Design an enzyme around this catalytic site. Structure first.
Site, PDB file in Angstrom:
ATOM      1  N   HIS A 136      -0.439  -4.500   9.298  1.00 29.63           N
ATOM      2  CA  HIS A 136       0.278  -4.472   7.777  1.00 29.63           C
ATOM      3  C   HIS A 136       2.360  -3.785   8.852  1.00 29.63           C
ATOM      4  O   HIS A 136       1.694  -2.958   9.111  1.00 29.63           O
ATOM      5  CB  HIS A 136      -0.139  -3.312   6.620  1.00 29.63           C
ATOM      6  CG  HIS A 136      -1.339  -3.828   6.587  1.00 29.63           C
ATOM      7  ND1 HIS A 136      -1.469  -5.126   5.185  1.00 29.63           N
ATOM      8  CD2 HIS A 136      -3.228  -4.163   7.273  1.00 29.63           C
ATOM      9  CE1 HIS A 136      -2.636  -5.026   5.109  1.00 29.63           C
ATOM     10  NE2 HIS A 136      -3.611  -4.768   6.286  1.00 29.63           N
ATOM     11  N   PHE A 194       0.774  -1.421  -0.051  1.00 32.28           N
ATOM     12  CA  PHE A 194      -0.092   0.124  -0.143  1.00 32.28           C
ATOM     13  C   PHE A 194       0.344   1.482   0.078  1.00 32.28           C
ATOM     14  O   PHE A 194       1.211   1.330   0.726  1.00 32.28           O
ATOM     15  CB  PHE A 194      -1.044   0.235   1.301  1.00 32.28           C
ATOM     16  CG  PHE A 194      -2.120  -0.727   1.502  1.00 32.28           C
ATOM     17  CD1 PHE A 194      -2.964  -1.878   0.299  1.00 32.28           C
ATOM     18  CD2 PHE A 194      -1.534  -1.227   2.494  1.00 32.28           C
ATOM     19  CE1 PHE A 194      -3.315  -2.197   0.750  1.00 32.28           C
ATOM     20  CE2 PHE A 194      -2.614  -2.247   2.958  1.00 32.28           C
ATOM     21  CZ  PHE A 194      -3.564  -3.128   2.407  1.00 32.28           C
TER      22      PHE A 194
END
Length: 180
Positions: free
Chosen positions: A130, A117
């Site tokens: 994450h 991301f």
């Protein structure tokens, strides 16, 4: 000047369809998350014989993030790391402090591959799930251009957002950046 140190940089030269849209440069936190950084950097240089060059960003959500790194399938189902298909979460030392922070996309615990991301807002809801390993230093306007692209029902760009070139830029002296 109190946050993590940038130890190496990566560039992406991006295109949206047949339009050159410019360069993004990331700073990566190799002292904090060396395994995760080494994967991303090696995929950017292509030095293991595979990686990000010629691959596309498969998911774009305005006011959230842009997502790339699936160089095997280009749809979120693929990607592989320099460590094999998947590898475990290194640590969660860093948070998603603000826009432009970069973390690994995954399919749950210990399923890091090659997908990432680039956040376009502060995304605290990703913290602890994450692995954060870098941030945009230059070319946030290129990220914004991708962020605004038209998408299909899967939030996939209608025009291919391609990493036309990519690689590393060495950092002689690691430098701390702010957690923002």
């Amino acid at each position: 000047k109190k946050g993590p140190k940038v130890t190496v940089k990566v560039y992406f030269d991006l295109r949206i369809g047949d339009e050159d849209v410019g360069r993004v440069i990331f700073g990566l936190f190799g002292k904090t998350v060396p395994k995760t950084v080494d994967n991303f950097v090696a995929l950017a240089t292509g030095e293991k014989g595979f990686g990000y060059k010629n691959s596309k960003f498969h998911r774009v959500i305005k006011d959230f993030m842009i997502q790339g790194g699936d160089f095997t399938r280009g749809d979120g189902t693929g990607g592989k790391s320099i460590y094999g298909e998947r590898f475990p979460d290194e640590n969660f030392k860093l948070k998603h402090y603000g826009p432009g922070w970069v973390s690994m996309a995954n399919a749950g615990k210990d399923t890091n591959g090659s997908q990432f991301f680039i956040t376009t807002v502060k995304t605290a809801w990703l913290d602890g799930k994450h692995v954060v390993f870098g941030k945009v230093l230059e070319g946030m306007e290129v990220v914004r251009k991708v962020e605004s692209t038209k998408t299909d029902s899967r939030d996939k760009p209608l025009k291919d957002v391609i990493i036309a070139d990519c690689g590393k830029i060495e950092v002689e002296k690691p430098f701390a950046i702010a957690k923002e």
